[PDB]
């Protein structure tokens, strides 16, 4: 069957997909062959099929780029056609995106295309969006026009023209800068369980509407601060194409008494209007302490208001509430109700493999030296949280800049991207950054 | 069996069947015969991602050319 | 007054009683009353009783009494004391010409304002304990009465693997098992285009395997 | 090169600077020989070089005084020119600053200049600002005019004209009364840690303007 369901890819590439050996044997697909991908909104995409034993026959593994290019999300069905006939690119015209080039002036062609395209022979089509990583960032690019039509393969003989004129972002076309499942690391089982619980409801509200079974109204996320729960919740909402509103306990607490309730009410009403939507509470503990802990009458009114809003939430509303708390001990008894936050998710400290995995995600935009080993650094950190690793990478980057760039001190006015490209982080920098560890 | 395609730079395709038991060396030795410049140095890589195989003893099943695949030719 | 742990289902019992006895039903939710501002709150309470008297015979049920009326040591708000006072005033204000039954749902006996134990007030006290095996077998039967099961499915054995599980937990365990089953069979075919008919959903059968999966999941709530 | 990076000075002297032994050998600089310093805002300065093993070849050690005089801060780049040909002062005219003299009236020439400028042969340039310490305080001064142009070397034979008229403080010109690194003691590794953390962000917004790395916001 040509029909398949989009799945997460293990391989991290623009134009790489993954299918089952039998599926390839069935459709007579060769490892290097180029498959044509038909999505929704009369959009088509070109990719390179690959053989993966792990992959299930009925599922296809692909990256956030092709999904966005195809305008499809997880729990949507696509159609794959073999494309035996393919001709090389003669000429290509591409213009970068305004938001990607922000704070970069100079000749970027030599430091983006040349590195990225090095006898890659990647297939592309006119009006396709692809992502290039350089200068310690991820720069999205669009295909303005191609002499060969509709699609072609990149060749070293082929001339690629790049002009320093940005194109205005299009509100239909979501950027890749957004938080994604690939951007979340150090949790496998935790993420999977969370994904499937909210998969069902958000994708098919009409099913849940026509079924007696009710979807879980409230989901609670455990674990210490710096683990990254917001980041987990945010990615899901963006990936599921559901309206995402973030509520911050301090922000709600800051507002004066009598308005706090208004703001909360406004937020919940707004979710109903833009339903299906996801509401996320960040500092739940701050909003609602324990009954013995709270000594303010006004505080009790705010808590009561939240409880009323939670009860108020219906099936028809199709709004999922996600709350984060540091410790289970500091939880209001009332919150632990089937009606309300029935669903509870325990986030354990990430394992060494998870910690290593996190490092790979943080270092994907930046340029690493051969001598630098993430595994060894991952081994040295036992109780370091995801945030700690990011801070270490940030601190290591700053040290690396101080060690090289400060000596030159040629950073006057506009800074060339290519200079930043030449900069590489040494293993010693990481060791220097690791040395200065104290919470 | 295992279908190995060689894509030349100058829009030339060579479709050659092989056995999964047969080593990489054999194909390289075949390519040397097929090409008019054996003395000329050449390297076979598979993309994406860009990577060449320095091992001649590596079998095709292990190499991941199952059932068939295409590899580019460069000098 | 109905003593029992949350989830036991006291609201459902009351609500049902009002349905089957063909008597007007009025639900009061502690938070909903607490959400309202001082003075407005008192009004709504006063507005609820008068409306119950108007539509007599009526039933007034408090979901979360402990919240409205916690113990005097635990209350630290003057306004909070005015709301309890208003409730007590509404309870003592009730006559025999009202023909209005007041039912309340609470948890622990030690989170109770002694004021509610008055002979004139909540004299009747009903200690709803956790159901035995049979009782929970009786619940599973209830929550499997619309859905289509398999011959291989044995509630007795499921009524033989939860110990400290309440009505909600079993209802949850039913929900999840059913949702899980749909993923296992329908997410693979996945023909959820436009309207969904009954004929495709009649074929849907839940295996024991579904139940085995849902049970493991740790829920201390 | 003639390009170097401003660094903290160990010596507690206003008109003294230091470089590395190798750096001196490269530019054939003599320990005593006066060095001309060009910074920013078309300003120049004259100081006395020194040899420090600790100092790096590409860095230069200097005090708060010269920074102000050159209108530069730490991390900035200055140009050093050798100045072998310098002529001795004949007539010098200096007026004190209004805020510095506050609370002190009378003849200060005998108790500020005489003590400070005793057999030192200090080099100064017209329109520069120098600090003398007297009467249990720091008193800043401005060179109004010098007979030799542009710069000159203070000598015992040279006559310095002191008249009791204060010049108005200028908003561009920052006073040395202000708190400085030199004024903070009893912190080494800690100062350094603090310094290096805020060094990049504060000096160059453009670096953090266009980068994926966030600087520390709260310390
Ligand atoms: N799974 C993860 N993978 C990578 N980085 C993570 C992950 N979880 C958290 N982080 C990092 O932790 C930091 C804080 O994330 P989060 O916990 O959502 O915020 P907060 O600190 O307010 O609780 C961020 O800088 C983020 O990069
Ligand atoms: N490192 C230091 N070097 C010199 N003086 C210092 C230092 N740290 C503190 N002091 C002196 O200690 C006093 C108090 O300093 P500070 O802690 O900033 O203020 P306060 O004591 O009023 O809170 C001041 O007289 C200040 O000059």
UniProtKB/Swiss-Prot annotation, chain A:
Give the result of residue 365 to H, as annotated. Answer: In IBMPFD1; uncertain significance
Residue numbers of Phosphoserine PTMs: 15
Q: Tell me the domain of life.
A: Eukaryota
Q: What is its main location?
A: cytoplasm
| Residue positions where Phosphothreonine is found in the record | 414
Catalytic activity, as annotated: ATP + H2O = ADP + phosphate + H(+)
Name the reported effect of residue 88 to A. Answer: Abolishes interaction with NPLOC4
Q: How is it modified after translation?
A: Phosphorylated by tyrosine kinases in response to T-cell antigen receptor activation. Phosphorylated in mitotic cells. ISGylated.
Q: Where in the cell is it found?
A: Cytoplasm, Cytosol; Endoplasmic reticulum; Nucleus; Cytoplasm, Stress granule
Effect listed in the UniProt record for changing residue 347 to T: In IBMPFD1; uncertain significance
* GO CC annotations, alphabetized: ATPase complex; azurophil granule lumen; ciliary basal body; cytoplasm; cytoplasmic stress granule; cytosol; Derlin-1 retrotranslocation complex; endoplasmic reticulum
GO molecular-function term, one example from the UniProt record: MHC class I protein binding
UniProt KW keywords = Acetylation, Amyotrophic lateral sclerosis, ATP-binding, Autophagy, Charcot-Marie-Tooth disease, Cytoplasm, Disease variant, DNA damage, DNA repair, Endoplasmic reticulum, Hydrolase, Isopeptide bond, Lipid-binding, Methylation, Neurodegeneration, Neuropathy, Nucleotide-binding, Nucleus, Phosphoprotein, Transport, Ubl conjugation, Ubl conjugation pathway
| Residues with PTM N6,N6,N6-trimethyllysine | 293
Q: What is the effect of changing residue 109 to R?
A: Severely reduced binding to DERL1
E.C. designation(s): 3.6.4.6
Q: Describe what happens upon changing residue 137 to H.
A: In IBMPFD1; without frontotemporal dementia; abolishes enhancement of K-293 methylation by ASPSCR1
Q: What is the effect of changing residue 133 to C?
A: In IBMPFD1; also in one patient without evidence of Paget disease of the bone
Q: Which parts pass through the membrane? A: none
What happens upon changing residue 161 to W? Severely reduced binding to DERL1
* Outcome of swapping residue 229 to Q: Impairs ERAD degradation of HMGCR and does not inhibit interaction with RHBDD1
> Per the record, what about its domains?
The PIM (PUB-interaction motif) motif mediates interaction with the PUB domain of RNF31.
Name of the protein in question: Transitional endoplasmic reticulum ATPase
Q: Which organism is it from?
A: Homo sapiens
UniProtKB/Swiss-Prot annotation, chain B:
The organism's place on the tree of life at top rank: Eukaryota
Q: Where in the cell is it found?
A: Cytoplasm
- List the cysteine pairs that form cystine: none
Spans traversing the lipid bilayer: none
Domain annotation UBX: ranges: 1-73
Disruption of the gene: reported phenotype? Accelerated growth of various plant organs including roots and inflorescence shoots.
What quaternary arrangement does the UniProt entry report? Interacts with CDC48A (non-hexameric) via its UBX-containing C-terminal domain.
The protein's job, in short, is: Regulates CDC48A by inhibiting its ATPase activity and by promoting the disassembly of the active hexamer.
Name assigned to this protein: Plant UBX domain-containing protein 1
Swiss-Prot record, chain C:
Cysteine pairs forming cystine bridges in this chain are none
Its protein name is: Transitional endoplasmic reticulum ATPase
The entry's function note states:
Necessary for the fragmentation of Golgi stacks during mitosis and for their reassembly after mitosis. Involved in the formation of the transitional endoplasmic reticulum (tER). The transfer of membranes from the endoplasmic reticulum to the Golgi apparatus occurs via 50-70 nm transition vesicles which derive from part-rough, part-smooth transitional elements of the endoplasmic reticulum (tER). Vesicle budding from the tER is an ATP-dependent process.
Modified sites of kind Phosphothreonine? 195
Question: So where does ATP 1 get bound?
Answer: 6-12, 107, 143
Locate the N6,N6,N6-trimethyllysine modifications and list their residues: 74
| Species annotation | Homo sapiens
The family line of this record is: Belongs to the AAA ATPase family.
Q: Where in the cell is it found?
A: Cytoplasm, Cytosol; Endoplasmic reticulum; Nucleus; Cytoplasm, Stress granule
Q: What is the effect of changing residue 76 to A?
A: Does not affect methylation by VCPKMT
Consequence of substituting residue 10 to Q: Impairs ERAD degradation of HMGCR and does not inhibit interaction with RHBDD1
Please list which residues make up the signal peptide. Answer: none
**Listed result of changing residue 71 to A:** Does not affect methylation by VCPKMT
**PTM comment text:** Phosphorylated by tyrosine kinases in response to T-cell antigen receptor activation. Phosphorylated in mitotic cells. ISGylated.
Entry comment, domain topic: The PIM (PUB-interaction motif) motif mediates interaction with the PUB domain of RNF31.
Highest taxon listed in the record's lineage: Eukaryota
Consequence recorded when altering residue 13 to F:
In IBMPFD1; uncertain significance
Q: Which residues carry this modification: Phosphoserine?
A: 221
Assembly mode:
Homohexamer. Forms a ring-shaped particle of 12.5 nm diameter, that displays 6-fold radial symmetry. Part of a ternary complex containing STX5A, NSFL1C and VCP. NSFL1C forms a homotrimer that binds to one end of a VCP homohexamer. The complex binds to membranes enriched in phosphatidylethanolamine-containing lipids and promotes Golgi membrane fusion. Binds to a heterodimer of NPLOC4 and UFD1, binding to this heterodimer inhibits Golgi-membrane fusion. Interaction with VCIP135 leads to dissociation of the complex via ATP hydrolysis by VCP.
């Amino acid at each position: 069957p040509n029909r398949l369901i989009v799945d997460e890819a293990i391989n991290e590439d623009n134009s790489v997909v993954s299918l089952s050996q039998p599926k390839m044997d069935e459709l007579q697909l060769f490892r290097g062959d180029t498959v044509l991908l038909k999505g929704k909104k009369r959009r088509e995409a070109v990719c390179i099929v690959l053989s993966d034993d792990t992959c299930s026959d009925e599922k296809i593994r692909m990256n956030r780029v092709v999904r966005n290019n195809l305008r499809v999300r997880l729990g949507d069905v696509i159609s794959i056609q073999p494309c035996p006939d393919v001709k090389y690119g003669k000429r290509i015209h591409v213009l970068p995106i305004d938001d990607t080039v922000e704070g970069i002036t100079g000749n970027l062609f030599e430091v983006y295309l040349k590195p990225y395209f090095l006898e890659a022979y990647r297939p592309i089509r006119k009006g396709d969006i692809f992502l290039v990583r350089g200068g310690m960032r991820a720069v999205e690019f669009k295909v303005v026009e191609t002499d060969p039509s509709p699609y072609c393969i990149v060749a070293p003989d082929t001339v690629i023209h790049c002009e320093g004129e940005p194109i205005k972002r299009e509100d239909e076309e979501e950027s890749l800068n957004e938080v994604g499942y690939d951007d979340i690391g150090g949790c496998r089982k935790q993420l999977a369980q969370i994904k499937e619980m909210v998969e069902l409801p958000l994708r098919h509200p009409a099913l849940f509407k026509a079924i007696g079974v009710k979807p879980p109204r409230g989901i609670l996320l455990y674990g210490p601060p710096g683990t990254g729960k917001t980041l987990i919740a945010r990615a899901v909402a963006n990936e599921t194409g559901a309206f995402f509103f973030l509520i911050n306990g301090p922000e709600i607490m800051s507002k004066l008494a009598g308005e706090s309730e208004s703001n909360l009410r406004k937020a919940f009403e707004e979710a109903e209007k833009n339903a299906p939507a996801i509401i996320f509470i960040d500092e739940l503990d701050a909003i609602a302490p324990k009954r013995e802990k709270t000594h303010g009458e006004v505080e009790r009114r705010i808590v009561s208001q939240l409880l009323t809003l939670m009860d108020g939430l219906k099936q028809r509303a199709h709004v999922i509430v996600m709350a984060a708390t540091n410790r289970p001990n500091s939880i209001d008894p009332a919150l632990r109700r089937f009606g309300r936050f029935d669903r509870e998710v325990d986030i354990g400290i990430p394992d060494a493999t998870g910690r290593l995995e996190i490092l790979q995600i943080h270092t994907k935009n930046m340029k690493l030296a051969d001598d630098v080993d993430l595994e060894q650094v991952a081994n040295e950190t036992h109780g370091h949280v995801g945030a700690d690793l990011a801070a270490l990478c940030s601190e290591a980057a700053l040290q690396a800049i101080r060690k090289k760039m400060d000596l030159i001190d040629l950073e006057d006015e506009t800074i060339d991207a290519e200079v930043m490209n030449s900069l590489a982080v040494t293993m010693d920098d990481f060791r220097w950054a690791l040395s200065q560890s104290n919470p | 069996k295992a279908v190995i395609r060689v894509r030349f730079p100058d829009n030339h395709t060579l479709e050659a069947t092989f056995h999964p038991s047969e080593k990489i060396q054999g194909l390289i030795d075949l390519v040397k015969r097929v090409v008019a410049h054996p003395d000329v140095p050449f390297y076979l890589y598979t993309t994406p991602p860009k990577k060449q195989i320095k091992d001649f003893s590596q079998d095709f099943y292990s190499a991941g050319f199952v059932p068939g695949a295409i590899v580019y030719f460069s000098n | 007054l109905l003593y029992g742990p949350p989830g036991t289902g006291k609201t459902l019992i009351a609500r049902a009683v009002a349905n089957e006895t063909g008597a007007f039903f009025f639900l009061i939710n502690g938070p909903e009353i607490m959400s309202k501002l001082a003075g407005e709150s008192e009004s709504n309470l006063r507005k609820a009783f008068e409306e119950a008297e108007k539509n007599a015979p009526a039933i007034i049920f408090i979901d979360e009494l402990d919240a409205i009326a916690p113990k005097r040591e635990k209350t630290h708000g003057e306004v909070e004391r005015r709301i309890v006072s208003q409730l007590l005033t509404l309870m003592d204000g009730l006559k025999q010409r009202a023909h209005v039954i007041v039912m309340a749902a609470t948890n622990r006996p030690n989170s109770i304002d002694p004021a509610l134990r008055r002979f004139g007030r909540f004299d009747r006290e009903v200690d709803i304990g956790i159901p035995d095996a049979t009782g929970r077998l009786e619940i599973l039967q209830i929550h499997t009465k619309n859905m289509k099961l398999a011959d291989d499915v044995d509630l007795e054995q499921v009524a033989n693997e939860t110990h400290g599980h309440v009505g909600a937990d079993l209802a949850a365990l039913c929900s999840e098992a059913a949702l899980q089953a749909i993923r296992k069979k329908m997410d693979l075919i996945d023909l959820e285009d436009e309207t969904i008919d009954a004929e495709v959903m009649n074929s849907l059968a839940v295996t024991m395997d579904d139940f085995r999966w849902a049970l493991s999941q740790s829920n201390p709530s």
